[PDB]
Design a protein around this ligand. Structure first.
Ligand SMILES: O[C@@H]1[C@@H](O)[C@H](O[C@@H]2CO[C@@H](O[C@@H]3CO[C@@H](O)[C@H](O)[C@H]3O)[C@H](O)[C@H]2O)OC[C@H]1O
Ligand SMILES: O[C@@H]1[C@@H](O)[C@H](O[C@@H]2CO[C@@H](O[C@@H]3CO[C@@H](O)[C@H](O)[C@H]3O)[C@H](O)[C@H]2O)OC[C@H]1O
Ligand SMILES: *[C@@H]1O[C@H](CO)[C@@H](O)[C@H](O)[C@H]1NC(C)=O
Ligand SMILES: *[C@@H]1O[C@H](CO)[C@@H](O)[C@H](O)[C@H]1NC(C)=O
Ligand SMILES: [Co+2]
Ligand SMILES: [Co+2]
Ligand SMILES: [Co+2]
Lengths: 434, 434
């Protein structure tokens, strides 16, 4: 797609700290950009929509190539349309924003310049952020994560994409998402099927795959840390059900691991660690600090700080595994006890290390779940299982929770705030901000 | 040996903090006891010495069993004889103390009660302490470490030892030391050879072996972190040169690894990390905090705090190894690049994990080195090597430094102070002391 300018594009600014092993941190200035799927897509020559509701213009978009030639992405009114605001080092995303139309959530990328994404090499480094999840009820996910996207959003590889990172192109993740309207500088109109339950979305014949580091998928009830390996590390198109992932018939018939090696302290048995109020170790009515460390072995370490008190990731015992480090032994034990082979089939932490050794783009989002109502995060899943099934219970939410239309109607003012992002060598980010 | 009471035994008290995963720490009250080798050893029935200078009484001690029956250990005047003092959570050890006789240094164990050693299970936990090394010049070693000693100092296994932990019996370490005067409730007079260079010491026909975790061996110039595995995890007697270690002909002909997998940041190439004054990352003229974490994988992590600034162990690159975690890959790369096979022959970190999974006793000591002048810690070693030999340079001290008689004469007022010991689950010890 190209870019149009009927609506101006001003990326909300966002600062973050780059820390050094020598003990100081220095401020960096970036900004955030909304993903292309949230944008108005119209004819290059007029205000006629190329996509409206969940269907494509059959005349503007008779095939993927013609569609991309005829159509452009336009600018975003971040606050009034999308409920996205920033202040200094803080970013807030509102759940439902009513303007001329209703918008639900957002997916945002941290930029290096007006036209390029910021890339982070996670291996050997740590990432710290503060989060307020107090306004996230059952069924919602305020997410902070990394994906192996191109810094230009795909322009160099696909010259029919001239919109680029400036307009939030080039997304990929470990679900090989097929809901994207543009992939590899082509539309995704071929094979398009409108969603049965979402007036705004559908599934196309192509998907976009890459490695994904889910540092944080969470609401006020549950939180999970999850690496997802793929056999191709970076962004790669996939065809139809061969994509695998959430948007396909066969979840496991592709190049990515859609399940990941997840660590949810509640799922692992510590039901007192994280939740609303003073009966939990971390009180989710209050802001908390989350630090994630990527040691060179490929294992992941985690600690939290709230009100000046520090907590390592809680210990878990699972089969022969015992500890609080997300390592090979943990992931292997998880598969053995909870089931599945996706993570290990895709190469486990060794394959994942190839992603963290390279550059990844920072994503912050707020979403509800039209496929599984977020039950995999905060409830019992599948819903017919009981607590006697190992790993079935992931949180205290009802198996009836998270219906998108219901949570959109009841909790429109839900929101997430991410702040005080700090990045640098392991051991460096607790030092004073500069 | 038995215990006598011509001199009373009052263990200087010492407090330390036990921390919990829930974020609080609670004070514990222990004390310290001096090792039996420093004590006066005399006839049970009189004040006649069983050992004097570096020779045994041929009449009281004609063989190991008769010697142990005839002889006892007596009490220690901690401050006036040994230069050992405590105040609250702080312990100081002076280098040379002049009383009726000259004493050099001390080796001390943390006690649980007046008659038993405190045991710590290191695996899954972390150990934090503060240290002032400013008064430790080249050739000195203020050491804090753990060994797999019996809590009773050997009494239950060897009933001819009735003196026990109260009198500091039962020592062992990875050098299988043969300088000990009593091992396994027998004297070590058989095969005794006086030291050629130390008026107070010798080498006997028996040694005492066990696993050793050297958290801290250091002076103002250099510091090292070193696990040492043994094929028998706990205390075990050894025979003659079959002992291996520093006190034997063949260093490597025994059950323990006398070399260990050492991590000295200077040895690994970072010559700016630790030293006297503001030109170093950690200024050794000032107190510093040292934290050591024993993850369940068997790897060891380390960070430091000085003046509120936190530093992870510096990154090192060695062969194919890159990182700051002391793990299997590091130890294997070290052997490949610096040479040696002792650590891996003895089972490496896997065998070492058997020690940290069990109980170990906390040792604090101050010593000079009558075998190698501490050159292996703070100089170039062996002394004929140059900086072009990988790992030869371990510190900036001259290869002429550390002659015991010289440093004892020039630096008698040298000292080390260890303080603010905190122990608990990984992530817990930075929380407020209680
Ligand atoms: O015509 C434009 C609309 O399409 C646009 O609607 C937004 C479309 O994206 C919606 O978010 C989806 C949430 O699920 C993700 O997986 C998808 O990638 C997203 O497409 C968003 O909720 C809608 O508001 O609004 C502007 C119109 O001009
Ligand atoms: O007779 C008693 C003396 O023997 C005692 O002298 C102390 C003996 O121990 C000395 O320290 C050695 C240092 O090296 C270690 O490897 C050895 O295990 C120790 O023996 C210490 O320096 C001497 O003061 O003093 C009291 C006398 O009654
Ligand atoms: C030494 O380590 C410190 C702390 O990690 C680091 O800041 C510094 O750059 C390192 N210097 C060298 C020469 O490796
Ligand atoms: C949960 O984790 C916290 C923090 O480590 C710990 O203090 C608590 O004992 C754990 N509770 C359970 C039930 O595992
Ligand atoms: Co195709
Ligand atoms: Co580790
Ligand atoms: Co014998």
């Amino acid at each position: 797609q190209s870019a149009c300018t009927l609506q101006s594009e001003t990326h909300p600014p966002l600062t973050w700290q780059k820390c050094s092993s020598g003990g100081t941190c220095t401020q960096q200035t970036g900004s955030v950009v909304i993903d292309a799927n949230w944008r108005w897509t119209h004819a290059t020559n007029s205000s006629t929509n190329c996509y409206d509701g969940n269907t494509w213009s059959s005349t503007l978009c008779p095939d993927n190539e013609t569609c991309a030639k005829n159509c452009c992405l336009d600018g975003a009114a971040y606050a009034s349309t999308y409920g996205v605001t920033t202040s200094g080092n803080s970013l807030s995303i509102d759940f439902v924003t009513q303007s001329a139309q209703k918008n639900v959530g957002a997916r945002l990328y941290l930029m290096a310049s007006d036209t390029t994404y910021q890339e982070f090499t996670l291996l050997g480094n740590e990432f710290s952020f503060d989060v307020d999840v107090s306004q996230l009820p059952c069924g919602l996910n305020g997410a902070l994560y990394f994906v192996s996207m191109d810094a230009d959003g795909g322009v160099s590889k696909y010259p029919t994409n001239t919109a680029g990172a400036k307009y939030g192109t080039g997304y990929c993740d470990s679900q090989c998402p097929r809901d994207l309207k543009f992939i590899n500088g082509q539309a995704n109109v071929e094979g398009w099927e409108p969603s049965s339950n979402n007036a705004n979305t559908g599934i196309g014949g192509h998907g976009s795959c890459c490695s994904e580091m889910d540092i944080w998928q969470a609401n006020s009830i549950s939180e999970a840390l999850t690496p997802h390996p793929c056999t191709t590390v970076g962004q790669e198109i996939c065809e139809g059900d061969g994509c695998g992932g959430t948007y396909s018939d066969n979840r496991y018939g592709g190049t990515c691991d859609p399940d990941g090696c997840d660590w949810n302290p509640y799922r692992l048995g510590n039901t007192s660690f994280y939740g609303p109020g003073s009966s939990f170790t971390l009180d989710t009515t209050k802001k908390l600090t989350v630090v994630t460390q990527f040691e060179t072995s490929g294992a992941i370490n985690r600690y939290y700080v709230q009100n000046g008190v520090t907590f390592q990731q809680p210990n878990a015992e699972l089969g022969s595994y015992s500890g609080n480090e997300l390592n090979d032994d943990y992931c292997t034990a998880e598969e053995a006890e909870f089931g599945g082979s996706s993570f290990s089939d895709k190469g486990g932490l060794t394959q994942f290390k190839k992603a963290t050794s390279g550059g990844m783009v920072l994503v912050m989002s707020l979403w509800d779940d039209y496929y599984a109502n977020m039950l995999w995060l905060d409830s019992t899943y599948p819903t017919n299982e009981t607590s006697s099934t190992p790993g079935a219970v992931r949180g205290s939410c009802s198996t009836s929770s998270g219906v998108p239309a219901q949570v959109e109607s009841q909790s429109p003012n839900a929101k997430v705030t991410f702040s005080n992002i700090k990045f640098g060598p392991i051991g460096s980010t607790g030092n004073p901000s500069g």
